Structures are given as structure tokens and as C-alpha cells.
Design a protein around this ligand. Structure first.
Ligand SMILES: [K+]
Ligand SMILES: [K+]
Ligand SMILES: [K+]
Ligand SMILES: [Mg+2]
Ligand SMILES: [Mg+2]
Length: 136
RNA sequence: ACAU
DNA sequence: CGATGT
């Protein structure tokens, strides 16, 4: 099992969990940063990992790219497959922004199609995903 | 246990 | 050490 180098890798970064959430997508081969989301004041790791995959799907579809997406998040890969982000984060005024984005990402999944393979990055074999924030 |  | 998730 080898890396598919012609791919997009995504990852979340956070300050606290729940805490400030951001995410980015990079070229797996070169590490070039292809997109970065503005920090969201309160969210969870898994909400961010979910949003990162969905943004990747939208990014690749817009560009007519058949590349797969790598994620290190077992949870978010399942949530995308299911089209449902099963987060425990309370809904209040401080979490409204993240929940709006998660709700809108689910809505996009429920109104669009894609063939993009969503692959598990095998951290135990390959080290940290190329989109990692280097904060752990 | 596994993945973050 | 704590949290988010299956
Ligand atoms: K990190
Ligand atoms: K990881
Ligand atoms: K646990
Ligand atoms: Mg990750
Ligand atoms: Mg990471």
C-alpha cells in the first residue's frame, strides 16, 4: 500500500478542542497550499476535518479534477460518506458560525455529485499528513 | 480498541 | 493531562 501522490491532502488545526478551528488543503506531492479557511472562533476537531474534506470536494469539482482526497480523520471520512456530521457540540450564539458552515456543507453534499475517492491517510505507516499544522 |  | 468521535 503506497501513497497516491497525485492527490489533495486536507487537515484541521485548532487552538483548543473545542476551540478556534481552521483547515487547509495541500498538494500531497509538493506541499503547495491550495486553500486555507479563515479561523472559526469555536468548533471541534471533527467539524473542522469534515469541513476540510467537503471544501476539497468543492475545490476539485470546480477545477474538473479527478484527484482523490486524503484525510487522517476516520470520523470525518465517515461523516462525508453518510452526508451527516454527527457532532456533539452544543448550539449557542458562540457556536452558531461553525454549525452554519457544517449545515451548509451537508446541504452541498445533498445537492451535488462527485466521484472523488476519499482515502485514509495512513499516519502509522507514512508519518503526518502533508496538510498538518505541526502543532502537536 | 481505533482514528484524531 | 484534556477533548472529539466510531
Ligand atoms: K498539528
Ligand atoms: K494525526
Ligand atoms: K476516547
Ligand atoms: Mg487531522
Ligand atoms: Mg493534523
Amino acid at each position: 500500500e503506497e501513497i497516491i501522490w497525485e492527490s489533495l491532502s486536507v487537515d484541521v488545526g485548532s487552538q483548543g478542542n473545542p476551540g478556534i478551528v481552521e483547515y487547509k488543503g495541500v498538494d500531497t506531492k509538493t506541499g503547495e497550499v491550495l486553500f486555507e479557511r479563515e479561523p472559526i472562533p469555536i468548533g471541534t476537531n471533527n467539524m473542522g476535518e469534515f469541513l476540510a474534506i467537503v471544501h476539497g470536494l468543492r475545490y476539485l469539482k470546480e477545477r474538473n479534477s479527478r484527484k482523490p482526497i486524503y484525510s487522517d480523520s476516520q470520523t470525518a471520512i465517515k461523516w462525508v460518506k453518510d452526508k451527516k456530521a454527527k457532532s456533539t457540540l452544543v448550539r449557542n450564539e458562540e457556536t452558531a458560525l461553525i454549525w452554519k458552515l457544517v449545515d451548509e456543507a451537508e446541504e452541498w453534499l445533498n445537492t451535488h455529485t462527485y466521484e472523488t475517492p476519499i482515502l485514509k491517510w495512513q499516519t502509522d505507516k507514512w508519518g503526518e499528513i502533508k496538510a498538518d499544522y505541526g502543532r502537536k
